[PDB]
Amino acid sequence: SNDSSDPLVVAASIIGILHLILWILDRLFFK
Amino acid sequence: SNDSSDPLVVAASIIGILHLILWILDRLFFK
Amino acid sequence: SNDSSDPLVVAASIIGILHLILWILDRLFFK
Amino acid sequence: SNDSSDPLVVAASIIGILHLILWILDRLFFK
Numbered sequence: 001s002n003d004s005s006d007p008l009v010v011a012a013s014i015i016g017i018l019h020l021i022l023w024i025l026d027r028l029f030f031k
Numbered sequence: 032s033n034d035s036s037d038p039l040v041v042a043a044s045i046i047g048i049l050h051l052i053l054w055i056l057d058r059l060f061f062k
Numbered sequence: 063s064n065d066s067s068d069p070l071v072v073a074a075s076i077i078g079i080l081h082l083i084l085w086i087l088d089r090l091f092f093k
Numbered sequence: 094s095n096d097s098s099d100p101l102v103v104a105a106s107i108i109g110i111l112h113l114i115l116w117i118l119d120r121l122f123f124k
């Protein structure tokens with residue numbers, strides 16, 4: 001399980017997607 | 032196909048490049 | 063050690079997490 | 094060469110580091 005997939009890869013996607021949620025919301029209210 | 036390449040890797044590039052398009056445009060109009 | 067894990071992967075996580083620390087702090091003071 | 098290392102990985106690092114150069118400069122002048 002872990003060997004077939006490392007948590008680093010999952011975190012990478014989460015960091016990008018998660019950041020977008022906050023960053024998108026910031027610009028969502030105003031351009 | 033999928034085994035040789037996971038969608039997570041592709042998404043990572045898209046997230047970075049995609050975000051840049053929006054982030055770049057924001058600063059494109061003004062410094 | 064290095065072969066089992068490349069520094070590029072580690073740097074990637076650091077770049078995302080590190081950037082968040084600075085970016086988060088910027089928005090931390092003000093929305 | 095290419096098989097041992099894909100351009101996607103290299104681009105990922107460049108995207109993060111490159112973005113930081115521009116993003117850092119923006120905040121460099123002002124907080």
Ligand SMILES: Brc1ccc(C[NH2+][C@]23C[C@H]4C[C@H](C[C@H](C4)C2)C3)s1
Nearest residue numbers: 012040043071074077102105108109
């Ligand atoms: Br900057 C930055 C944002 C996201 C980053 C993670 N990218 C990778 C690309 C590929 C190599 C590793 C692990 C997976 C797949 C995610 C790093 S680096």
